[PDB]
Amino acid sequence: SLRRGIYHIENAGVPSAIDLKDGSSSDGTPIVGWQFTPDTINWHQLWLAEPIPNVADTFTLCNLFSGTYMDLYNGSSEAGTAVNGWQGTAFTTNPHQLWTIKKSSDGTSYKIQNYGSKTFVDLVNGDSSDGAKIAGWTGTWDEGNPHQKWYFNRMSVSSAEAQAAIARNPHIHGTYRGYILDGEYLVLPNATFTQIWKDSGLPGSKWREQIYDCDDFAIAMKAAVGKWGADSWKANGFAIFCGVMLGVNKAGDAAHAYNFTLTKDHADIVFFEPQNGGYLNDIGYDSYMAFY
Amino acid sequence: SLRRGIYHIENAGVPSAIDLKDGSSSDGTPIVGWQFTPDTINWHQLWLAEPIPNVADTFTLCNLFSGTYMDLYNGSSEAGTAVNGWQGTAFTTNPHQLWTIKKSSDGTSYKIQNYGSKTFVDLVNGDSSDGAKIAGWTGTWDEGNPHQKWYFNRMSVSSAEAQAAIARNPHIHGTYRGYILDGEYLVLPNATFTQIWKDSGLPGSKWREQIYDCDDFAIAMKAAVGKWGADSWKANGFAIFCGVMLGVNKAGDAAHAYNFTLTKDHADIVFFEPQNGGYLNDIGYDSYMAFY
Numbered sequence: 001s002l003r004r005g006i007y008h009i010e011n012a013g014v015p016s017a018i019d020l021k022d023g024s025s026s027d028g029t030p031i032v033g034w035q036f037t038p039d040t041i042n043w044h045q046l047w048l049a050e051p052i053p054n055v056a057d058t059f060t061l062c063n064l065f066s067g068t069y070m071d072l073y074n075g076s077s078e079a080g081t082a083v084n085g086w087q088g089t090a091f092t093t094n095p096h097q098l099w100t101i102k103k104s105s106d107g108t109s110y111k112i113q114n115y116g117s118k119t120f121v122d123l124v125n126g127d128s129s130d131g132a133k134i135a136g137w138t139g140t141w142d143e144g145n146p147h148q149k150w151y152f153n154r155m156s157v158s159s160a161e162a163q164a165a166i167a168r169n170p171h172i173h174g175t176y177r178g179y180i181l182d183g184e185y186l187v188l189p190n191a192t193f194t195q196i197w198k199d200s201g202l203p204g205s206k207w208r209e210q211i212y213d214c215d216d217f218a219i220a221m222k223a224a225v226g227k228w229g230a231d232s233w234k235a236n237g238f239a240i241f242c243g244v245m246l247g248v249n250k251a252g253d254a255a256h257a258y259n260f261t262l263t264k265d266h267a268d269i270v271f272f273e274p275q276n277g278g279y280l281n282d283i284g285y286d287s288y289m290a291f292y
Numbered sequence: 293s294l295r296r297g298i299y300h301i302e303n304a305g306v307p308s309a310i311d312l313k314d315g316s317s318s319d320g321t322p323i324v325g326w327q328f329t330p331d332t333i334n335w336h337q338l339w340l341a342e343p344i345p346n347v348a349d350t351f352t353l354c355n356l357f358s359g360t361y362m363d364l365y366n367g368s369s370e371a372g373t374a375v376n377g378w379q380g381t382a383f384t385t386n387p388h389q390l391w392t393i394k395k396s397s398d399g400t401s402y403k404i405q406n407y408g409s410k411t412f413v414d415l416v417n418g419d420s421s422d423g424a425k426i427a428g429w430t431g432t433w434d435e436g437n438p439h440q441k442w443y444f445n446r447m448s449v450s451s452a453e454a455q456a457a458i459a460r461n462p463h464i465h466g467t468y469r470g471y472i473l474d475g476e477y478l479v480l481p482n483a484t485f486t487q488i489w490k491d492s493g494l495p496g497s498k499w500r501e502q503i504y505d506c507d508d509f510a511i512a513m514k515a516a517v518g519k520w521g522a523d524s525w526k527a528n529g530f531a532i533f534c535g536v537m538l539g540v541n542k543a544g545d546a547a548h549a550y551n552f553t554l555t556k557d558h559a560d561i562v563f564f565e566p567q568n569g570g571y572l573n574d575i576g577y578d579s580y581m582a583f584y
């Protein structure tokens with residue numbers, strides 16, 4: 001099954017992604033094919049898939065930017081029916097906004113079927129131009145048709161996945177936990193993570209003993225990421241991944257504070273030095289407290 | 293012995309405090325008697341006492357605002373010698389900036405003696421007017437003279453004192469620790485703590501599931517306090533007290549995040565709700581992680 005998560009949805013045949021035109025949160029806003037830059041935040045192309053309680057393999061798809069939902073217009077089974085962004089709710093009973101998502105065929109990409117119409121999300125004619133029409137179209141679960149095949153590029157981790165990554169890291173010991181009970185976390189490309197840091201006021205903040213110390217840079221970074229996420233995205237029910245770790249030597253004579261992020265494959269924790277913007281794998285010693 | 297700490301130094305005879313004129317960090321800035329508002333931050337009247345390694349009962353006194361030190365002018369033993377703020381260092385060997393601080397007589401207030409001149413810090417003539425001269429003056433360790441008697445109103449806690457207060461609180465369990473190894477923390481009057489919150493952007497920040505959740509308000513408050521301290525004070529080697537606690541129900545079905553502060557007697561932890569600015573004693577349940 002597709003996991004609950006944030007996905008960048010990329011067409012199997014041509015390198016277009018599912019784009020919400022200009023990220024508008026207006027009802028009736030077209031969802032179109034559009035190019036993307038990998039390992040960046042693609043602002044109008046991020047989709048939060050929420051699983052529907054007791055409908056198997058079926059999700060709402062909320063655009064992160066707009067906070068509006070992928071909507072098959074008036075639920076029509078007609079080939080060429082518009083797919084738009086439309087106001088909604090995560091666990092709606094509106095089938096215009098319910099999508100059964102299952103693997104093709106190739107066993108790797110998915111098909112996206114409207115729960116009501118039973119038609120599939122189609123990049124019409126496999127058109128790779130920017131703003132190319134996306135519509136509901138007749139199709140089958142097992143056919144090879146690339147217009148209806150989409151890679152679900154997982155952009156997020158669950159609390160469980162986050163814990164497991166921290167659990168396999170040699171530098172995080174003692175207590176480590178996420179605040180959110182079963183959260184979904186957008187893992188930022190380092191490019192984006194660095195952007196936030198650059199605009200945070202930390203680069204030009206001076207380290208000062210006790211009064212503006214390592215713990216403060218780490219905290220300040222995490223707040224900057226908190227604020228950025230809230231200000232940048234209209235969707236709710238997800239968080240931005242940014243850990244804080246607080247550590248001490250074997251000798252209680254040196255302390256360290258770091259932020260941490262995740263590799264793009266979501267397997268490994270990487271540390272971030274909020275004073276100068278460095279990424280680090282080996283910081284040894286460890287922490288007594290890590291949260292995200 | 294006087295403990296290392298931040299003190300508001302109030303004359304025993306009249307209600308004047310040791311004031312650094314206009315908080316200027318200019319060498320030669322007069323230190324004068326001046327009125328104060330209790331349970332507020334008195335901006336020019338806060339003094340960080342640092343103990344001198346291997347000189348008993350002897351401290352530097354650094355004004356928090358200016359980052360300059362109480363200085364007896366050219367070290368003169370002459371009655372009426374000026375006491376000024378002057379650039380320096382915490383563990384300086386300059387006796388103009390070294391002060392032996394010991395209890396009077398009344399067993400409660402202290403006398404402040406220049407280590408070099410052996411004369412005492414004197415509110416000249418017990419003059420309670422604002423801007424009244426403070427000078428070095430002949431005196432004795434045991435005399436009753438109120439001009440040379442000063443209450444050291446402790447404004448701060450050590451890491452040890454902070455731990456002990458958290459240790460006696462029924463709502464803080466699991467891991468709790470301060471980042472700084474033997475830190476000195478200014479405990480804010482709630483009035484000041486509330487001011488920071490009011491100007492932090494939190495009052496008008498909207499709670500949003502996961503993306504701007506309780507952990508984020510708590511973190512954001514702590515960063516606001518971090519920034520306020522750095523921006524407000526020129527002295528180093530001290531921190532502002534503001535804890536963060538992260539908690540969960542017995543049932544893993546409800547989470548809470550709070551900040552915490554200390555009572556003015558430094559004995560008890562009080563929780564702060566960063567969403568709406570509330571102060572709370574009983575939050576039960578507890579935390580799994582608390583830091584400051």
Ligand SMILES: CC(=O)N[C@@H]1[C@@H](O)[C@H](O[C@@H]2O[C@H](CO)[C@H](O)[C@H](O[C@H]3O[C@H](CO)[C@H](O)[C@H](O)[C@H]3O)[C@H]2O)[C@@H](CO)O[C@H]1O
Nearest residue numbers: 019020021022023034035036037040041042043044045130
């Ligand atoms: C209100 C308004 O008109 N704002 C404009 C933005 O919508 C527009 O942002 C672009 O929106 C499109 C389509 O909705 C794309 O999402 C685009 O990003 C994508 O294409 C880029 C090249 O066009 C690039 O490849 C990105 O990597 C990819 O995500 C997005 O920038 C901008 C710029 O066109 O103008 C705004 O004023």
Ligand SMILES: CC(=O)N[C@@H]1[C@@H](O)[C@H](O[C@@H]2O[C@H](CO)[C@H](O)[C@H](O[C@H]3O[C@H](CO)[C@H](O)[C@H](O)[C@H]3O)[C@H]2O)[C@@H](CO)O[C@H]1O
Nearest residue numbers: 027028071072073074075086087088089092094095096097
């Ligand atoms: C035969 C016919 O045309 N039927 C109409 C329905 O399709 C229509 O339902 C609306 O369809 C739109 C576009 O597909 C949305 O799906 C809409 O649902 C969402 O928007 C509503 C506000 O516009 C509201 O916010 C809902 O909570 C949200 O789910 C859906 O109502 C209805 C209603 O217009 O009319 C039928 O005649």
Ligand SMILES: CC(=O)N[C@@H]1[C@@H](O)[C@H](O[C@@H]2O[C@H](CO)[C@H](O)[C@H](O[C@H]3O[C@H](CO)[C@H](O)[C@H](O)[C@H]3O)[C@H]2O)[C@@H](CO)O[C@H]1O
Nearest residue numbers: 311312313314315326327328329332333334335336337422
């Ligand atoms: C650069 C400049 O001139 N700034 C002025 C401030 O210095 C001044 O701040 C006052 O400074 C005095 C003496 O240095 C006191 O510290 C004063 O605070 C104290 O007195 C207040 C009444 O005068 C009140 O009682 C406070 O509780 C007590 O701490 C402090 O405000 C201000 C205001 O005079 O003007 C600035 O422009």
Ligand SMILES: CC(=O)N[C@@H]1[C@@H](O)[C@H](O[C@@H]2O[C@H](CO)[C@H](O)[C@H](O[C@H]3O[C@H](CO)[C@H](O)[C@H](O)[C@H]3O)[C@H]2O)[C@@H](CO)O[C@H]1O
Nearest residue numbers: 319320363364365366367378379380381384386387388389
């Ligand atoms: C007989 C006589 O007058 N002796 C002079 C000394 O008093 C004087 O020492 C200076 O005194 C000032 C005012 O008391 C300061 O105490 C000063 O120390 C601090 O300031 C220095 C810069 O001004 C420097 O920053 C030091 O590191 C710091 O401790 C102290 O030097 C000396 C030097 O002027 O001259 C003697 O003739």
